[PDB]
Amino acid sequence: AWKGEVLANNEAGQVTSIIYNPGDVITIVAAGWASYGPTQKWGPQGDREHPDQGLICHDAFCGALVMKIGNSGTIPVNTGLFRWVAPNNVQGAITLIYNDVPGTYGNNSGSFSVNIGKDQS
Amino acid sequence: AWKGEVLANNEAGQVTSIIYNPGDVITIVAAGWASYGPTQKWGPQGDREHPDQGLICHDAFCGALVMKIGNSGTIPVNTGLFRWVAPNNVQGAITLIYNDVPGTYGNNSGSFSVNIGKDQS
Amino acid sequence: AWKGEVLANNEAGQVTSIIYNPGDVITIVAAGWASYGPTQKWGPQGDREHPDQGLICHDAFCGALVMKIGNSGTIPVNTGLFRWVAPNVQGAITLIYNDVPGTYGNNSGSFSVNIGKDQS
Amino acid sequence: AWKGEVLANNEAGQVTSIIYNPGDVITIVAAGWASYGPTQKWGPQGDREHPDQGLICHDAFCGALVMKIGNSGTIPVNTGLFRWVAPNNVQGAITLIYNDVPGTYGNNSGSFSVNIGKDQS
Ligand SMILES: COCCOCCOCCOCCOCCOCCOCCO
Ligand SMILES: O=C(c1cc(O)c(O)c([N+](=O)[O-])c1)c1c(F)cccc1F
Ligand SMILES: O=C(c1cc(O)c(O)c([N+](=O)[O-])c1)c1c(F)cccc1F
Ligand SMILES: O=C(c1cc(O)c(O)c([N+](=O)[O-])c1)c1c(F)cccc1F
Ligand SMILES: O=C(c1cc(O)c(O)c([N+](=O)[O-])c1)c1c(F)cccc1F
Ligand SMILES: [Ca+2]
Ligand SMILES: [Ca+2]
Ligand SMILES: [Ca+2]
Ligand SMILES: [Ca+2]
Ligand SMILES: [Cl-]
Ligand SMILES: [Cl-]
Ligand SMILES: [Cl-]
Ligand SMILES: [Cl-]
Ligand SMILES: [Cl-]
């Protein structure tokens, strides 16, 4: 399992030591507070009212936690994933990233704490 | 394992199928949007800015997910618990509850979806 | 989890630390060689050729590994159980060598056993 | 997870659906009765009395269950493995094989039933 933090201001995100392989079942729990600019904070589901003006992940809100598996597209994580299997063929290291518009990360603050483990399969 | 929905307006909470037994390791993942009154909705960590005017759980924010194990006091859950073991001597049915001030649940809205499992031991 | 040895000559069995609770999923792996009397040795499934003349567990061969959960009837284990859920039963697991009561004194050897709770 | 049968007479082994990947923890349980020739049958540890006259796996008895992981050499399984991790540099599909002398599988009988699963990490 892996435990670590992902910074809201980082467009490159945080590479984990978890390698997702076909058939793997994983569990993620994410917590904390961040902002994509305003003087308020949101949890890892982000801000459900904010428009999408070019988010890296169009399937999660602005300020949400998302991931990639290897060189996949972005995949929503939000508060986490319970005994989850990837619905498409993806493989490789999990990278955690804060969902924001590229070029707009400089006014971001805060971080999410994340735990990830492989489950029985 | 258990999956279900906890209503923000349910002051009594939701008794799950899960009986926490001595030695149990559990994982909880909670998602969704709920409000303790405002138009805005929060995630399972609740609203970090709101004052505590008599929440049922003083160790979590207003609008957070919390629980009881048997007849315990409230225990924070938030976005969830990763491979977690309860305090000495706590045991019995898990009850999930929305953290609000007693008497003020009637204006609450939304729900959290929650999964609970037992981990290897 | 629990890891240990179960002695063929112990009629009373081996009380483990595992308290099986309703809904629990467990895995057991058992290995090794034991005898219920002959010079030969058998694995955890016991001796498929020996008749049952009053074994403590009628659902396993003579010389097999079996168990009880709390004060239950005997339940076959053999080489082990994969991600298994018990019938109906609650309490501590006791592992026992399947022999005819009164006939344990000529037994030899032991089985090595791992038990864990799985995800559920 | 994978559940299936390995025929004592199958010199090629039974290829499973399990791809062992670096860092995987697995559990195997094997049961049943097979023979390498005689009328008697043995369990998955095989026949402790039979000499080794050129077994595919010299670290297990004649008639034992063994495996390969990808193009590895043979690794004993016997009655099974409990939360086991492979040597480094071993990866790929698990193939289960009855331990006998090459060229002598044709007088074999019976089979083992085997379960394989990946464990938490
Ligand atoms: C962990 O330390 C906290 C210490 O709390 C002191 C103990 O308070 C016990 C009472 O909790 C009052 C909060 O009631 C909230 C309402 O729940 C309803 C559900 O109930 C189900 C259990 O039958
Ligand atoms: O969604 C955003 C948007 C998102 C941000 O995180 C952010 O920091 C800013 N910003 O401070 O200007 C704009 C946006 C955009 F990227 C282009 C046009 C209009 C916008 F609202
Ligand atoms: O924290 C609350 C408080 C909390 C609520 O969930 C709620 O629905 C209300 N309400 O709508 O009146 C007040 C509170 C209180 F309990 C007393 C005085 C002032 C408050 F804000
Ligand atoms: O199954 C057994 C049986 C089993 C034993 O392990 C053992 O040690 C003995 N014994 O030494 O008498 C008999 C048995 C029996 F109980 C009565 C008659 C014939 C038997 F083989
Ligand atoms: O161990 C074996 C051996 C093992 C077998 O399973 C088998 O079927 C036979 N066989 O029938 O030839 C020989 C062996 C050998 F390989 C050479 C000489 C003597 C042996 F028993
Ligand atoms: Ca921003
Ligand atoms: Ca309220
Ligand atoms: Ca005996
Ligand atoms: Ca043969
Ligand atoms: Cl980061
Ligand atoms: Cl939240
Ligand atoms: Cl805080
Ligand atoms: Cl696989
Ligand atoms: Cl055996």
Author numbering:
A (entry chain D), B (entry chain C), D (entry chain A): 1 to 121
C (entry chain B): 1 to 88, 90 to 121
Manuscript text:
The notorious pathogen Pseudomonas aeruginosa relies on the lectin LecA for host cell adhesion, invasion, and biofilm formation. LecA is a homotetrameric lectin with affinity for d‐galactosides. Importantly, binding to LecA is highly dependent on the complexation of a single calcium–ion present in the carbohydrate binding site. Following a different rationale, we recently reported on catechols as orthosteric, non‐carbohydrate binders of calcium‐dependent lectins such as LecA.
Substitution at the second phenyl ring with small substituents was favored in the ortho position over para and meta as highlighted by 33. Additional X‐ray crystallography studies were conducted with selected derivatives of Tolcapone. In contrast to Tolcapone, here only single binding poses were observed for both compounds and no crystal contacts were found between neighboring asymmetric units. Gratifyingly, both compounds bound to LecA in a similar fashion to Tolcapone in binding pose II, which was determined to be the dominant pose in solution by STD‐NMR. Consequently, the key interactions of calcium complexation and H bonding to Asp100 and Asn107 for the catechol moiety are the same. A notable difference is the observed presence of the usually conserved water molecule, which was absent from binding pose II in the crystal structure of Tolcapone. As hypothesized before, the ketone of both compounds is in the correct position to form a water‐mediated hydrogen bond to the backbone of Pro51 and Gln53. It thereby acts as a mimetic of the OH6 of galactose. The high torsion of phenyl rings in 33 allows for improved hydrophobic interactions with the side chain of Gln53, in line with the entropic contributions determined by ITC. However, the distance of the carbonyl to the Nτ of His50 is increased (3.8 Å) compared to the distance observed for Tolcapone (3.3 Å).
